[PDB]
Design a protein around this nucleic acid. Sequence first.
DNA 1: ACGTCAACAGTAAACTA
DNA 2: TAGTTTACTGTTGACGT
Length: 129
Amino acid sequence: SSRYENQKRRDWNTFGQYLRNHRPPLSLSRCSGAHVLEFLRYLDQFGKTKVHTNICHFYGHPNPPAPCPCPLRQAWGSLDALIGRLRAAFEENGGKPETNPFGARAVRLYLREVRDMQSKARGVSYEKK
DNA sequence: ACGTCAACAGTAAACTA
DNA sequence: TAGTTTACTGTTGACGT
Ligand SMILES: [Zn+2]
């Protein structure tokens, strides 16, 4: 809880610095669905999860026995949880719930695409056991 | 109204400094 | 070492039948 809230607060300030370091400078009210997805793609550089391409032999193998030049991405579970924290952080800082940019349909569709593509590429299942 | 899903909450690990 | 945060887990509330 306390670690979760500080994690949420840090993500909210990280998203704030992201908007200020955006070029052109991006305001919160102008954070369209495309811009939120642009933010989620920007975070792939900090991911640690190997997502194999369809030409790599290790596609669908969660524990390859050799390195490959396939890119590292944010896992679906990281993005799913981050969206939950940012959804709350937006409303905890006075944002109207029905204007929540992290609740836009484009966010839901993107997370589903990441879930289905990574499950095939990684060979893992994101369903709750 | 169970059966699932959505909407966040919460924990674990290992990498960075 | 200790802090961070990606990655994985958990669950109340809401949805769907
Ligand atoms: Zn690969």
